[PDB]
């Protein structure tokens, strides 16, 4: 539907599914997976060449994941612009590139005139929605304007009445090109090209369609996995994390440490902290965690895998979760069903405790709550109150029962 290039993963390769059969050359340095993700690295052989058929107002869309700046190389990050995708014929065409937290789209007509349009994301947020996380880019061009959309929403709109005819016949090269660091890479997914200027409506629909999966995602946007170490993030308490309380079978809530060095330009909260959790299947064939799956939520206490429990019979709306070694106790529940109450794209998920798989009886959802001692302290909890709230439309992203799982990732160092 107005699509003239559709790069998708087939048979360990990248193929044009547009119907026009552009040829696609995937060199040895490009890592590929069956989640349609490909990685461009610093290597000379990390490159993709596609040749458009010549017998063919335009738009480019794709998902991208850009690693975090190194806390050592901020100056290079802010100043060294580098190409990722270039499309030049007779010194004319287009090009996407990155300089730090800025992704930029440039045009250059037949005379060599230039305009550009960028999206820059914040590099001082405690928790960022963009840094090293999958997000959706769409770039549209017509007679007068170049617009950039991020996750379906308009972010930039530069005027280009100056810029006229530009050539898009040329070969499209996917390749990191500039004064990049050795460790620089970029992940990309679902690259497409359209012979029309997409509307905000089309772009937002594509965003929802390409977000949908049967499975849950991790904090980074990748599929959520069984048997993999995760730190836990709460979207209703962004700067808080869970820690097993010394000499008590409960998880206390603490405040995240932050970046603690001398840079005017950057700030973030630490992500690799709190207990190392891990999800285990409750069996009834890949390691992907799907919506409505029944799971055990565990964590590592020294060299012991412990488990997250709830009392079967507690009085109030809320009760502190019970953290303890793996064992069968008919005083506690241990089975969790992982949910997705959000209709809209999110990397949040929710955690429901139930009596049994077959029972429609719901105990409550995992969240964070203030409790009174003798003072007032947050604890890792279950609450019955979440049960009605998650049914409300539109879904409430800021609820404490929204959790995200953060595995160690090479795009994020702290």
């Amino acid at each position, epitope marked *: 539907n107005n699509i003239i290039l559709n790069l998708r993963y087939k048979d360990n390769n990248l193929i044009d599914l547009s119907g026009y059969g552009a040829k696609v050359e995937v060199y040895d340095g490009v890592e590929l997976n069956d989640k349609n993700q490909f990685k461009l690295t610093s290597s000379a052989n990390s490159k993709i060449r596609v040749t458009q058929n010549q017998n063919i107002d335009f738009s480019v869309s794709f998902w991208i994941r850009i690693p975090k700046y190194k806390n050592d190389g901020i100056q290079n990050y802010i100043h060294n612009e580098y190409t990722i995708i270039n499309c030049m014929k007779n010194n004319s065409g287009w090009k996407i590139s990155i300089r730090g937290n800025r992704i930029i789209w440039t045009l250059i007509d037949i005379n060599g005139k230039t305009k550009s349009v960028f999206f820059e994301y914040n590099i001082r947020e405690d928790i960022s929605e963009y840094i090293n996380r999958w997000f959706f880019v769409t770039i549209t061009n017509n007679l007068n304007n170049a617009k950039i959309y991020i996750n379906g929403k308009l972010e930039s709109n530069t005027d280009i009445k100056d810029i006229r005819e530009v050539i898009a016949n040329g070969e499209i090269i996917f390749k990191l090109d500039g004064d990049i660091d050795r460790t620089q890479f970029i992940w990309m997914k679902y690259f497409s090209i359209f012979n029309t200027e997409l509307s905000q409506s089309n772009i937002e629909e594509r965003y929802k369609i390409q977000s949908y999966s049967e499975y849950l995602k991790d904090f980074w946007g990748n599929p959520l996995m*069984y*048997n*993999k*170490e995760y730190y836990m993030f709460n979207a209703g308490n962004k700067n808080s994390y869970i820690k097993l309380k010394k000499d008590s079978p409960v998880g206390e809530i603490l405040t995240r440490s932050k970046y603690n060095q001398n840079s005017k330009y950057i700030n973030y909260r630490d992500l690799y902290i709190g207990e*190392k959790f*891990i999800i*285990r299947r409750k069996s009834n064939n890949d*390691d992907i965690v799907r919506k409505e799956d029944y799971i*055990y939520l*565990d964590f*590592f206490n*020294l*060299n*012991q*895998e412990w*488990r997250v429990y709830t009392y079967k019979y507690f009085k109030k709306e809320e009760e502190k979760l019970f953290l303890a*070694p*793996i*064992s*069968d106790s008919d005083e506690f529940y241990n089975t969790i069903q992982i949910k997705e109450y959000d209709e809209q794209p999110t990397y949040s998920c929710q955690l429901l405790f139930k009596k049994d798989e077959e029972s429609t009886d719901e105990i409550g959802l995992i969240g964070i709550h203030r409790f009174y001692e003798s003072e007032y302290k947050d604890y890792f909890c279950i609450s019955k109150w979440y049960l009605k709230e998650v049914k409300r439309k539109p879904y409430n992203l800021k609820l404490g029962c929204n959790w995200q799982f953060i595995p*160690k990732d090479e795009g994020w160092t702290e």
Partner: nanobody
Amino acid sequence: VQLVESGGGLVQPGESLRLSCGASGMSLDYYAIAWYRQAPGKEREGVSCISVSGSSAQYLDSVRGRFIISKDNTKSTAYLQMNSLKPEDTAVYYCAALADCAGYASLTFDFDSWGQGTQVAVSS
């Protein structure tokens, strides 16, 4: 609630040693047991893992056929039987109690900083 290694020793190539992994405070009836070893200052590596049921075992390729992992629920201890020992087996051995063997080898236990472990050395 402690999970402690013992049975390490100093031996000659070809000889045998038996490590035990003793659980206190809890019971291994629900636990899959993994062994790891770390030589100074090489990369730490997964050595073996036995299932909760005890009917399935996994081995590092370089120890298969020499090492036998087993688990005795009634004693709450699991074992690494090490036969035909070689110099390359020299390491500090650590154990962990897991829900499941899946993914065991790439778990990031900070044994160096809080591990106890038991020392194994092989030299002719």
